[PDB]
Symmetry: C2
């Protein structure tokens, strides 16, 4: 959530920045609730002062031997009036809280202003798409002809938009996730984690999935939800913690499945290798360049052509203040398709989680910054490898870096 | 479920075999429902014959020019009486079905008769427990001193009986699952599969988890449940299929998380490498010996002492007709603890799934047999490695076979 002082001191400057995202900040409704809150606050304080004043009068009447029942009744009446005012105040503060939790993050000033994906900007591209001297086959066809892709079985077991993979296709899916985890833990300094795939309400509020995106989640009847991304459990490891500035940055990675109820068709269950960084406020723009490069290295080592785009204000996700997307070349569609997204979240999540860092130079604490990106989505990487490394006879060349993970195999099929 | 002809022809012999498991087969309630079913059946056939007879009389009255409204009323009255009888019959057949789906599998005659775990029989043991010249540390302490085990973080993210693993401890957990998958796919002839971790009602009925064990499952509000074991999705791949006898045996393996709502404390989420075999009826006792040996090979290659026990009738699981349990030596407890269970399920699941095989010698079909076992439970294997390979200074020696999977590491810490 946003800094509450920013909303109170300059609501119009905040409403301007949010309008770039296409979000209408109802400054009038918020200001009315803030005013009614202050009135109720004064009311409870006035009633409190009256109650203490009437208590003194009861004490005097006791000492004089007078009857205190008419005074006792009024003090009890006041205590009920005070409870009613406190109930109204707590309901009003919860309504303000509800609204504040639905406000997206403020975009960084450097982010291009735009309404949708057509205003995203390409900032670089790497590699040259392979020229094919035969007709290019799509990944589904390739998966079916190697008996490694069965959508019909997945419908029988579960339902639509699930996948079953078998044989060498499943082995390559597995090899990709191991290669990615090894790369980020051995070369890029990320620490490996096994996390739960079910999380509670507080974890989802912490990273921003709740309340706005409850409908995108699978909930389990022990009030849990399946994780939509490893960002949720990983980032919440520092929830409520105060971290010494010398311990930063905390770099975490994990291989998890991701669940979402809702070019490349998105599944309800898919695998991702996620990267998460907890950093000092003044280092987060640098960390985003570092993290994006880590995702690019995966693409480069696998030899997949890609392009880097910076998302415009109108296409960014709820919690991001700046986002880079990597799009990999998909031969059978003759265009690039998203495969990775790296975002700087600023202090948006840290504020909900109360994740702070302590400087020791003055022992004062401030909110950390959080960043997250995928390096990479495993299933989407598999689609890119299958299509870009296909041969004329339908076989698929195993990229060099995956061979050690696939018992030396050079070709599939 | 059991053969319905077995229940009808010799209910008393079946009730005797089920009593060995501690299951009371209500033969009287079932026989009453069977009798009431036959009566209703005859009733609907009698009403049908009356309806056809009255239709002929209506036709004659038409030809004579008589009024057919009194005859038309009685035929409509009969059609309602016939619908009421069909509704009662379909409700009664569903009640019989409900009961039949709660009946456990018949144990094999060779299985020791007993009431509980105290009547299980040890049939072999391998390896000698290491003698320690220092005080033995438990796996939790060892995990905490290598900063690779955080139960408190798991409670913060989710709740109790979940675990977070970090660093080299998570890497060894991962290495174990890769070693197991590689062993079973490269050496033992199992085919690798990526399956959904959510499944529908029919899949759970197919393998026997529903209806009796609905309360052990996490259900997601798209009426799905999280898998309690990869046995559920893997075995249902042949649901409704007719398999050529020459295609058998089908040997499948998968690495999945397992979810269960409910010595070694069981978690709600834990990893398993599962082995599943679809086989000819006359090969399933041999397949169980083969599959158990595959699980033993994992223990032997990791150098962990274990013992093999055959479960008695009273300790077997719902669907098993014969089960071997492997128990690994747990130093800090000075006893063996379950780590693997391999079961022959006979035709129990095949019957619910209608998985049949065709011989081609006479093109006649019969139910297949299914088998399942874990090779192994990854998290439990990790606990055994950590405790049996600990050194005096708290470090943990990485077993030889895992070193290639852990970038050559020889020690943890």
């Amino acid at each position: 959530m946003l800094d509450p002082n920013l909303l109170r001191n300059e609501p119009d400057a905040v409403a301007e920045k949010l309008a770039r995202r296409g979000f209408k900040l109802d400054v009038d409704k918020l200001g009315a609730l803030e005013e009614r809150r202050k009135v109720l606050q004064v009311k409870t304080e006035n009633l409190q002062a009256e109650r203490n004043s009437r208590s003194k009068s009861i004490g005097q009447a006791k000492a004089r031997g007078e009857d205190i029942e008419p005074l006792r009744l009024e003090v009890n009446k006041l205590g009920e009036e005070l409870d009613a005012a406190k109930a109204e105040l707590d309901a009003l503060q919860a309504e303000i809280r509800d609204i504040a939790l639905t406000i997206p993050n403020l975009p960084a000033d450097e982010v291009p202003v735009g309404k949708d994906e057509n205003d995203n900007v390409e900032v670089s591209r790497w590699g040259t798409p392979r020229e094919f001297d035969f007709e290019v086959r799509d990944h589904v066809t390739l998966g079916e002809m190697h008996s490694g892709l069965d959508f019909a079985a997945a419908v029988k077991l579960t339902g639509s938009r699930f996948v079953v993979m078998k044989g060498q296709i499943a082995r390559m899916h597995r090899a990709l996730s191991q290669f990615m985890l090894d790369l980020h833990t051995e070369q890029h300094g990320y620490s490996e984690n096994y996390v739960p795939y079910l999380v509670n309400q507080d974890t989802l509020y912490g990273t921003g999935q709740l309340p706005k995106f409850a409908g995108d989640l699978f909930h389990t009847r022990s009030n849990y939800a399946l994780i939509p991304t490893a960002e949720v459990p990983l980032t919440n490891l520092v929830r409520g913690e105060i971290i010494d500035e010398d311990d930063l940055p905390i770099k975490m990675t994990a291989h998890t499945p991701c669940f979402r109820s809702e070019g490349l068709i998105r599944m309800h269950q898919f695998d991702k290798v996620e990267m998460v960084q907890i950093v000092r406020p003044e280092d987060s723009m640098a960390a985003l360049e570092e993290m994006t490069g880590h995702a690019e290295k995966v693409l480069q080592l696998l030899g997949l052509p890609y392009r880097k785009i910076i998302l415009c204000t109108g296409d960014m996700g709820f919690g991001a203040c700046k986002t880079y997307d990597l799009e990999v070349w998909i031969p059978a569609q003759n265009t690039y398709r998203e495969i990775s997204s790296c975002s700087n979240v600023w202090d948006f999540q840290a504020r909900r989680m109360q994740a702070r860092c302590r400087s020791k130079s003055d022992k004062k604490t401030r909110l950390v910054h959080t960043l997250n990106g995928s390096g990479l989505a495993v299933g989407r990487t598999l689609v890119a490898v299958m299509e870009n490394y296909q041969q004329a006879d339908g076989r698929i060349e195993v990229p060099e870096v995956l061979r050690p993970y696939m018992n030396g195999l050079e070709y599939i099929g």
